[PDB]
Each structure stands twice: as C-alpha cells, then as structure tokens.
Design a protein around this ligand. Sequence first.
Ligand SMILES: OC[C@H]1O[C@H](O[C@H]2[C@H](O)[C@@H](O)[C@@H](O[C@H]3[C@H](O)[C@@H](O)[C@@H](O[C@H]4[C@H](O)[C@@H](O)[C@@H](O[C@H]5[C@H](O)[C@@H](O)[C@@H](O[C@H]6[C@H](O)[C@@H](O)[C@@H](O)O[C@@H]6CO)O[C@@H]5CO)O[C@@H]4CO)O[C@@H]3CO)O[C@@H]2CO)[C@H](O)[C@@H](O)[C@@H]1O
Ligand SMILES: OC[C@H]1O[C@@H]2O[C@H]3[C@H](O)[C@@H](O)[C@@H](O[C@H]4[C@H](O)[C@@H](O)[C@@H](O[C@H]5[C@H](O)[C@@H](O)[C@@H](O[C@H]6[C@H](O)[C@@H](O)[C@@H](O[C@H]7[C@H](O)[C@@H](O)[C@@H](O[C@H]1[C@H](O)[C@H]2O)O[C@@H]7CO)O[C@@H]6CO)O[C@@H]5CO)O[C@@H]4CO)O[C@@H]3CO
Ligand code: CA
Ligand code: CA
Ligand code: CA
Ligand code: CA
Lengths: 597, 597
Amino acid sequence: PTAIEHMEPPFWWAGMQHKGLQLMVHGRDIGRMEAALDYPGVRLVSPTRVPNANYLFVDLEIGPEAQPGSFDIVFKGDGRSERYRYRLLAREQGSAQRQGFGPGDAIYQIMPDRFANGDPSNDNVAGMREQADRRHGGGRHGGDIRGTIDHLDYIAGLGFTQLWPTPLVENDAAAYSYHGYAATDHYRIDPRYGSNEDFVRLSTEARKRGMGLIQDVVLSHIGKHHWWMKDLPTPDWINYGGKFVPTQHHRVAVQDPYAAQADSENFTKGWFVEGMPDLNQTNPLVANYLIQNNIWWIEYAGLSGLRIDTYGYSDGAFLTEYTRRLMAEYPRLNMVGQEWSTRVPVVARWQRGKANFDGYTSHLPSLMDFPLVDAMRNALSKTGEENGLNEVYETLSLDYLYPEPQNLVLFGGNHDMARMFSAAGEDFDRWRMNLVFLMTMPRIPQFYSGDEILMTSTVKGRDDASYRRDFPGGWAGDKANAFSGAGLTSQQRAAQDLVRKLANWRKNQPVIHNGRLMHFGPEENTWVYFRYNKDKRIMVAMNNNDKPMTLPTARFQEMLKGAPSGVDFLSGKTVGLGRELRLAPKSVVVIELPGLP
Amino acid sequence: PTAIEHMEPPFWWAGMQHKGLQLMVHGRDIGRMEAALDYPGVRLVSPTRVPNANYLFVDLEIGPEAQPGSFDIVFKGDGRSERYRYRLLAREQGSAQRQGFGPGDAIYQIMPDRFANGDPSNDNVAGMREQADRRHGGGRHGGDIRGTIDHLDYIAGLGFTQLWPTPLVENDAAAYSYHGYAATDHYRIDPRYGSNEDFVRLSTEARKRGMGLIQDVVLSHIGKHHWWMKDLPTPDWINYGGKFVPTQHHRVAVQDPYAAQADSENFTKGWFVEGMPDLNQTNPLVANYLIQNNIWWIEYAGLSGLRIDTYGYSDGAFLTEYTRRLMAEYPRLNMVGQEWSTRVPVVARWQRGKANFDGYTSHLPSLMDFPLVDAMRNALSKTGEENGLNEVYETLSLDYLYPEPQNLVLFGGNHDMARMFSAAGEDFDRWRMNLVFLMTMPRIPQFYSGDEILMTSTVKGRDDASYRRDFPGGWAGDKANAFSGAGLTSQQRAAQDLVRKLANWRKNQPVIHNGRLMHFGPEENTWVYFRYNKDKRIMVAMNNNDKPMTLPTARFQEMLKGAPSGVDFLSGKTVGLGRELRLAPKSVVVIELPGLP
Ligand SMILES: OC[C@H]1O[C@H](O[C@H]2[C@H](O)[C@@H](O)[C@@H](O[C@H]3[C@H](O)[C@@H](O)[C@@H](O[C@H]4[C@H](O)[C@@H](O)[C@@H](O[C@H]5[C@H](O)[C@@H](O)[C@@H](O[C@H]6[C@H](O)[C@@H](O)[C@@H](O)O[C@@H]6CO)O[C@@H]5CO)O[C@@H]4CO)O[C@@H]3CO)O[C@@H]2CO)[C@H](O)[C@@H](O)[C@@H]1O
Ligand SMILES: OC[C@H]1O[C@@H]2O[C@H]3[C@H](O)[C@@H](O)[C@@H](O[C@H]4[C@H](O)[C@@H](O)[C@@H](O[C@H]5[C@H](O)[C@@H](O)[C@@H](O[C@H]6[C@H](O)[C@@H](O)[C@@H](O[C@H]7[C@H](O)[C@@H](O)[C@@H](O[C@H]1[C@H](O)[C@H]2O)O[C@@H]7CO)O[C@@H]6CO)O[C@@H]5CO)O[C@@H]4CO)O[C@@H]3CO
Ligand SMILES: [Ca+2]
Ligand SMILES: [Ca+2]
Ligand SMILES: [Ca+2]
Ligand SMILES: [Ca+2]
C-alpha cells in the first residue's frame, strides 16, 4: 500500500451517543507504528496490537466537549511518520431524533441495477471485474443513481413515502455483481451506480419529495473479492479461518430448546455460499466495524432506517449489541430484519420487546412479515380450496406473538419471490384483493417496483433472474414505458392507477396507521374485516370465488351497528348493508363509515 | 310420571376437596316441593328455585366432619311427600393422590363398539332406538365391555399401560349411536356396552394387569335424544334456546386479539351438528352438572385420567373452572384436551402454566399433539420432497411454546383420521420410522387399535367409517384373529411384533420418559436425534429416502463424544459411528449407548 490505504470510518461526528470511536487503519507496515494526536475532548486510548503488520486499530474516546473540526493523527515508527487529517463533523439539527419509517409510510422497493439507467457511461467502469450485459438474466444491466433520482417524482406520485434500494455498496465480482449482496467495499458506492456523494444526493432529493431512504445492509457476509480477503486483518476475521465451510441453513437452531451447538454455529458461522465469506462477529473488531459502518451510513446519507439482510445468520450476541448501539444513537429509527421463515414464532423471536424462553434480548424494531405474505399468496393460489382465506385470518390471529405487530413490514412481493401478479395467477381481481389487503392491514406496507404494472415471472421454486426484469421505461429506447404510460395495456395502466389511488388514499387514513382491527372468520372464501377508531370505520369485504356470494349482515353488527349502506372507494358504487351484503364474483370493496360511539 | 325420575349425582363421597354438592332432582312437580335432611356434617343451603316445576336443585355443603353413611332427603308440598336415600361413600385409600397417565405410559385407544363383541346378546337392547347392523359403516357392530375385558391381556402384552375407549355413556339415537359422542344419559353406560358396574369392573381388571383407564368426556354437547330435550330444565340450559344454530368452527376466535364476539360466541355456543344440542355452560347449574358428573366417574370408576373432546367448543370461563375443580380433587391426574389444530400456538394456549396474552388461565395438563403428528405424516407421505423431515424438526423446535411439552400426547393415529399405515402410503419401511418416532419422542405416546396389524383406510378427505373397521378377531367367526395371530399375513404379524417389541422396551426406558432431547436439523430427508442423560443415550437415525445415505459423524460429536459404535435395538446389529453412519435405503436405527457425562 501507499502510506495509509484505508482509514475506516474515514471521518466521524462530534456529539454522538457512544463516545468511543475505533479506527481501522490499513497500509503497508502501519501496524508497526504508534498513533499520536492532540485535540481538545479527544483521548487516544492504549494500543492493542494485532499480529498483521498491515493493520492498526486506534481507539479514541470523543468527549461531549469535542467540537467539530479536524486534527492530525500521526503514525510514527521505524524512523518514519505518516499523517491522516481526521475530521469531526457537526451533526444536522435533529439528527439523533430522526423519525424512522412507520405505519403511516409506504415503502417502494427497487434493485438499482434494474430500475433506471440514467447514465449509460457508468455501465462499465475501467478496472472493474464485470462487463455489463443487458441480455444476461444475471448480468449488470446498467441501472444507476442518476436514473433513480430522475424518477423520484414518479415514485412519490404513486403515493410512496420511503425508497428501499437493494445494496449499492461496491460489489466488484467477476460474475453476479448486479445484486449487491456480496460487498467488496462497505465504505464505497459501486462506481457503476455513482459516487458516495450521489448517494447522499439521492437521499436529499428523495427528502425534498417527502420520501425517506432505507439502506439495505448485509452484516453476516461479504464478497470473496473484498480487499480484506487478500490479507486477512486477523486470522479469525472470517469464520472457519477464511476458508469455505457452507451453512446448511438450520435457522431454528438459534432458537430451539433441543438445538445442537453444531447446528446453531453452522447457522451463524457457516458461509452462505462459497462466494460469500462469513464475518466472525464474535471478534470485537468485526462487531465494532459493522456497527460503526452502518451508523456512518445513517449519519452521512441521512437515512430513515435500514433493511437488514440475512438477519439470523449473524451472531446472536452481536445482534443484541448492534441493535442496541443503533437504537441508542437513533431512538426513533426503524430497522426491518429479514428473517425468512413462514413460521410466526421464528420471526417474532427477534422483535424488540419479545419475552423469549431463553432470555434472548433484541432491539430490532421490525421484521418482514413472510408468514402473512405466504398465507395470502396461498389463499389466492389455492383456487381449488373452499376456504383458503382461512390461512390469512388464522395467521393474523397470531399477532399477539409479536410485541409490536403494527411495526412489521407487510409486502406485495420483493426481489426474491415470484411476481405479485403471477402469484395471483395473473387474475386481476385476485391481485386487487392482495393490493387492498396490503394497503389496509395493521402493518407497514412495502411494494416491489414493477408490480404496479403487473410484471410477471415464473411461479415455482427460486428463479431470481425472473423476478428482476428491467423496469419498462428505465432504458433509452424502451417501447413500453411505465413512467410515461406508453405501451402499457389498459389492464397494466389500470393496475398502476389503482396503486396510485390506494397508496395516496392510505397516506391520509390514520385509522389504517393506528386503528384497531376486527376481522371475521372467512366462510367459503369470503372475508370481512374492519379498521376502526372513534373517527372512522373502514370495512373491507372480499369474495374469493368465481360465483356471487350473499352474506347476511347480522353477523357483522358489532362493527356495522345498523349502517344501511356505504360507498365502495374502489368502484365508487354504493353497497347495501341493511340485511345482506351482495358480493360479485372475485370482488373486493372498501367502505368508509363514520366512527362508532 | 315416576316420583323422582332422576337424582344426579345419585350418590357422593365423604372427604372430597370441594365441600359443595348440588343435586339436580327431576320428577313431576318436584320443583313444587321443599327438601329436608338430617345428617351430621351435611348442611342444606336453602332453595334457589327454577320456573320448571319438574326440576329441583338442592344445594348441600358437605363439611370435613361428615362421615360415610346414608341419609334421607325428604321433599314435601301439595299435601304429598317424596324421599331419596342419599349415600356418602368412603373414598378408596389413595384416591385423591391417584397418579394420572404420564410420560412413562403408552395409551391404547379403542372404539368400544368396534373392538370386541364379547356378548352378542346385548347388541340390541329392548326399547332402544337403533338396531345393530355390522354391515353398515355407520351402524352398531356390537362391541362391548365384556369383549374389551376378554382382551386386556392382549393390550397389556403389547406393552400398553393405559386404555382410552371412546365414550361408553348412553347414546340412544336412531342413527350413528355407535360412536358415543352424543350422550343421552351422562350417568349411565349404554346398555349395549353393559352396566355401570361392568365399567367399574373394566377399570379394576385393567388395574390388575398394570393398566389405567382413561374416560372420553364430552362437555360441549349432548345428543338430541337426551331426556332433557323433552322438558328443558331451564330455558337457557341449551344454547340458542334449545334451537339448532350451527357453529362455523372459528376456533381461533376464542384466543385472537382481533376477534369478533360473534365468532367467539359462535364457536362456544354454536351447535356442532343438528343432532348435538349445545350446552350453555355459562349457566352455573350446567357448569356444576358437568364438573360433578366427571368427578363422579373418576371417583366411582377409579379412572387414571380423562380425554376431553371438542376442547375449545366449551365456554372458556367454564373450562377454567372445570379444570381447576378437577385438578383440585386429583392434583396428580392427567387430562388430555382435544384441540384439533395443526398450529402449535393454538394448542399451547390451553396448557396449565401458559402465560397468555389475554390472561386466560387453565389447569389442563395435556393436549393432543396434532401439529407434530401432521408434520410427520407429511414427511413420510410426500416422498418426492428433498427434505420433508424438516417440517418435523421445525415443529418440534417450537416446544418452548408449551409449558410442559413432555406431558402432551403424541399419537400414531385415532378414530378421526386416515389409518397410520395408509397415511404412510402403505410403505412398511416408512411406517417403521413413524412407529420409532412415536415411541422415542419426549411425549406420552398413544396408539390406535388396529394400527398394530396395518389396517387401512381411505386417505383423501374425511371418511369416518373407513377409520373404524372392526378389529379382526373381535367377533365370533372372524377368519383372521389378531389377538391369537391366526390368519395374519407376514407383514401384519411383523408390524404387530414391532409394536410389541418397541412398546415393551419403552416401558423400561426412563431416558425416553424424562431424559433430554437433542435433535439435528434434517438434511436431504435424513434425521438424527438423541434422548440422553448420565445413564444412557438413545440415538435415532432415519433415512427417509429410497437410496443409501452416509452421514459424517463429526457433526454429532456433542452427543457421540467419540463413541466408536453401538448396538441397534431393532436389528441387534452393531452400527459403526467412528467416522460415518451408513444408512441403508428407507432405514431407521435405534442405537443404544452408554450415558453422556
Ligand atoms: O443450495 C441451496 C440452493 O442453491 C441453489 O441456488 C443458487 C441460486 O440459483 C443463485 O442465484 C444464488 O442466489 C443468490 C441471490 O441471487 C442473491 O440475491 C443473494 O441472495 C440474497 C437475497 O437477495 C436477500 O434478500 C436475502 O434472502 C435470503 C434469505 O435471507 C434466506 O433466509 C434464504 O431464504 C430462503 C428462506 O429462508 C426459506 O424459508 C425458503 O423460502 O427459501 C428461501 C430461498 O429462496 O435465502 C434468501 C434468498 O437468497 O439474502 C440472500 C443472501 O445474501 O445471494 C444468493 C447466494 O449467492 O444462490 C444459490 C447458489 O449459488 C440451487 O438453485 C437450489 O436448488 C438449492 O436448493
Ligand atoms: O364430538 C364431535 C366430534 O368432536 C371431535 O373431533 C372434532 C374436533 O374437535 C372439531 O374441532 C372438528 O375438527 C375439524 C375437522 O377435523 C375437519 O375435518 C372439519 O370437519 C368437517 C369434515 O371435514 C366434514 O366431513 C364434516 O364432518 C362430518 C363427518 O364427515 C361425519 O362423519 C360426522 O362426524 C361425526 C363423527 O363421526 C363422530 O366421531 C363425532 O365426531 C367427534 C370426533 O370423533 C371427536 O374426536 O361426531 C361427528 C358429528 O356428527 O359429522 C361431521 C359433521 O357433519 O363436517 C365437518 C365440520 O365442518 O372441520 C372441523 C372444524 O375445523 O371436527 C372433529 C372431527 O369430527
Ligand atoms: Ca448506468
Ligand atoms: Ca454468519
Ligand atoms: Ca355385544
Ligand atoms: Ca359449545
């Protein structure tokens, strides 16, 4: 290396909650040196040396009296000296109290490579290991930050208030770089997306449009081409001594009274795939690194929260400390973990407030509601079943297992699953039911880019390329363009208009954000539920059958209290409620009524 | 009619835990009368009248100073007087402390009409509404108490230590009387089975052979031919005023934060079927009636516990009081509730010691483990799945939801589901895996009569008659006799030999009764688990594939601790364990090893 090759974090802030700052310094023979500084309020601790000559860890304590400014950190040894001018930034007013995404928000999810190519010139970047190929399902297609910024008006116009892009951090792999989940530099935006500065600008431009930005963070693993892999900072930085030992994905092993240590270790230490070296988070240097890096991104880019990948694949004790550190800095933040299980108890284990049988404590505010998404996809697909909606009702009834079920993220789909429209059997009427459900449940709704124009995919197993097709209109020359409307079918445009109608309506319905829910047991694949408070009732009724259904309204009188009729927000039709509710085949209605006494 | 037509309970005991005793007296204008008695230690409370002149409720407080003996209760009014000689029996020594069935037991379930016809002369009883018809799948076939007693040596010899017959109380219906679930007289054995005394004899004879007797009690409903229905004791005795209003079976409605009262009431008050009037257990007279009746059967017939039908279909507050009362009398008893859900949270809600979100409390010791049975049947039948056993492992990992998972009843099958052998696809090798699992899990195993000779049924849908075919050998003239072994095929006899082998072995295995369990996540439909303590290890390994599989034993070292080999109890063969476990296609081994320090 040349003097100091990497300084991480590269700068920090005065006035953080945790006073300690640990710098990870990288350069040839830097480990052979001693650090010194002189700045009021900043104390240099006592060297803890690592055996690798090319790394030095420097512990600072930044007292509350430290002012924003800069100071040289000088590194002396072997008759030489090296300098780094370290900067402490002033924090933005209100930084610590930043409001995280919550029940009043709706999240729009993109994959940056697959959304919009605003700058074809950065599709390839000289020096990088992969060449772009738009026709390869696993290739880089060239979407970037410029393209995303170009279309913030569209996203906000649809009624979304938060943007979640899959990771933009450097993934300099020879193949499958596009997906972002195998970081090769945690402190750098992949140059094919743009610069670190462009990412900050994406945040500021989103904010001007009333949208927060949620970063997708991977804690458990990196990519095999990470610069660490050439010269391991410590022998135990990577689990299994830096050699590939696969995980077998026994997720319940971390939360099972009958667990073998072999299985729990294999889950948190095993490598996801050979191309994804697993971080040893039981090493305090690794824990500190990840915690500081994510805090750095939040403070630097003005994030509204995080989506945390591969949640339970990280060490359990590390996760307690990581979530504690993050929530201590930003007490109103939201962070949504991805615990990919359709079992309510497995997901609920991780949410802040949960009383666990083993005393495990977490500070994680939110999780992805895979169980409920799975239940609704089953109801919509199992067309041969008399009462598939029962799975949704019974899954919802388990919400008492979560300390804060209204903070969970419910989603129409994402980059890992069959397209929402395909999961509905390409049945527009069933799709409407799914969309109404998403927009009215006591959850934080998240929507996957492309679903608003009924993009389709394969349905069975895992077929990732199928779920990540280029957004129509994201590339110059596209003959179907969802941004302008050009080339959409009437049905695709109707879907898009309905997404806009419901998402913007939801923004202004406090009863959906924090109201009570009363649902009724589904009967013959009809289902009725209500969101309600002193101000408003919203009645949802769906008929998941190809025949009409007539439901006596006596059953629902604890919610209806004699209401003779109402207007369906969707179709705008009046709907009788006096004695019977007549539902057309495959109908869903959404009826606003005044609040109960 | 007859002066006093019913007196219930007909006698009681000195020295019960609960001092109060409420007599329900029935006869023409008995309600017009005034009761009187004189017996030291017994206090007559003073009448609380009901509008029906044909019923009188007499409230007694039997003090701890009351001695065994008998006394007249005299009823006076309208210039007339009636009397009943009331007996307080002395309790058998050790009655209150009786040990309920538990983890060391194995339960053999029969339907008394379908097991053994020891006396063809009671197949029909003069005056009753249904005639026997052995060729009707829903008819009475003639099984009785005599036949069951005749074959107690068989049941004990198979290794079972408890007998659970489906209900024997009078079911005097014109159709479908055989199954027992629609009582027409809670204080009388159906005369087609025998007398009350014969049932007591069944208990005493079973006890001689080391077996307890578990009674199957229905609390929620009765049959429409119950004598009550002719002259309702009170207008609210039966839910919905004695008129048929069906339940829609929304079982989660009683334990759901979002529940409608309509749905909860429909679950606990709705009639199961038109032929099964639903008891209003919110009426304290009905609550007292059922609590006393079940105590009466336990005390009178020397039962080891109860199996409680249609568990959540009874009023929740009633269940709290009923379980408290029963367990206050018999603190060591076991009672297994039938909460038919494959959702672990739904089942776990009811077990004693559970901290429920709504504060619901219960003294119920046990429930039927439908979730784990369903998981194993899926694993063994869906043989095209790569790792179907993963469902069993994950389900078992949720055991922390239950306060006492070791006290749950796990079963091979029962009278309401597809025959065990048929559910395993008539695959004897996979059926062996089910049987080994049943006999080695940290549960109380229950086995269904006929499964030991691989009786078959339909598998699709619900076909009750198909699950309940007569036991071969239970009727004079049967061509095959499973009791003697005559006329069994080699595969039938092999099944029966394996049941006898494993159940008798299990009686002698404290490590299965109360040892720890450590299981490993299944991989490619192979699964390894251990029962262990300082005295013994039992390693179960199953290969749920039609191909050989080899498992490196390094994975299991926390349990194996370098064991080079062990003897498989099934085959008697020594199995190598030093470096790998080599499993043949579709095999299961039960390797016995020394203790784990
Ligand atoms: O040996 C198992 C399996 O391997 C083969 O699949 C290969 C696959 O074809 C290939 O594309 C690659 O997948 C990549 C993927 O494209 C990337 O996106 C990245 O995946 C990350 C993902 O985007 C994240 O959102 C996140 O999702 C994870 C979850 O965290 C996990 O829990 C797990 O979810 C499973 C869930 O737990 C189960 O309940 C069940 O529903 O199945 C889910 C999987 O569908 O995985 C998801 C999705 O990956 O985290 C991911 C990792 O950061 O990285 C992936 C790995 O490179 O991986 C495979 C090998 O190269 C083969 O086709 C299968 O037949 C075989 O069974
Ligand atoms: O004492 C009554 C009954 O109770 C116990 O089992 C109950 C259980 O407690 C209930 O929660 C409920 O569970 C499920 C079923 O498992 C599920 O299959 C479904 O049930 C429907 C059936 O699918 C459908 O065929 C029909 O069932 C009919 C049945 O075909 C008839 O044979 C007849 O069943 C009688 C049984 O033969 C008799 O043993 C007794 O059942 C007991 C059961 O043994 C006991 O362990 O009485 C019944 C009723 O006469 O009639 C029924 C009803 O017409 O309809 C049902 C209901 O839709 O849904 C329920 C609820 O989720 O049922 C089980 C099993 O009966
Ligand atoms: Ca580009
Ligand atoms: Ca890991
Ligand atoms: Ca008989
Ligand atoms: Ca009932």
